[PDB]
Amino acid sequence: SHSMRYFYTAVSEPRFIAVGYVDDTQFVRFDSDAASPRGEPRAPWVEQEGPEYWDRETQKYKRQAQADRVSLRNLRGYYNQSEAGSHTLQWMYGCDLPDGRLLRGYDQSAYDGKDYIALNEDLRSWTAADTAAQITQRKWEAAREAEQWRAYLEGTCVEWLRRYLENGKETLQRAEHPKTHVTHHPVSTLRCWALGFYPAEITLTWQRDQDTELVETRPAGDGTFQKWAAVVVPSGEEQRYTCHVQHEGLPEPLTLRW
């Protein structure tokens, strides 16, 4: 359906980057390595929000950046790691919406790329990955932060994501169909292309009447995505293969022959 997502990265003052997504559309960023670190709009539907909205977001990141420089120091102490090594703290949370209500909220954390601590599906308990996260879970259980997570995920995350979908309905609630074509290269290869589609969810399959080479969906840089699927066929047998494209922007699916 629809999802608002946030990705926080603190690398060891430390480097703090925060990014917000609505579906596959980025709408906010924060970079501690900017000339004036602040919450910057990445989508036109969030640009017209008042200065009281943006300054509250900016001071949120500015104080979240300070919270991570001490957290990385506390994490370095839990594991007895050296003060010279670089370490990464990752923070992930968001809310999924068909009736416009919370389908699932999530909250995950990662230290150095492995799972550290995560809010449970009940939004009232935690799961620690090791004895270091048990100190963090006990820290957040004393503060009862899972209660504040309920207030955000079940509420603030849902109503504000619903507002973003309304102000940007011209682009967010609009599926761009892929522009497909087949290329042929001699090897002694039939590549099926898909360009300029939104969202990134697409299915590329080469049928004959497990052997396709898929690539991960890449961003075009304009808000759309690209992806191709290549298969190897013997010479004189190209007329037997048909590429199939499934996408939300397509009235009916597309079949393609060389």
Added chain:
Amino acid sequence: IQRTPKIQVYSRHPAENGKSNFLNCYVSGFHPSDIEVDLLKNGERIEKVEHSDLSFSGDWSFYLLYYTEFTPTEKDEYACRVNHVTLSQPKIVKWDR
């Protein structure tokens, strides 16, 4: 634990000589976040190279989109040089129209 980056070199729109486009280098699925990505025009580093904000996928692996505006020509060869802590030496992926 370190993940090696996947590299994809491509243009935003279908390449057509004499017309303006955007050269892309998409690094993804790598950890840690530190990565060296350079866009090359005939073995020469490009000054005006932008990149997206650092995000990561569900498996905590990062992805970045290094992009720049360029005009493809029949003779000029483009490539992307990527360096990561997981590579014994920088990997260069040439552009294929």
Added chain:
Amino acid sequence: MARELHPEY
């Protein structure tokens, strides 16, 4: 709309 200030680890 981002999450408010979270307690430290």
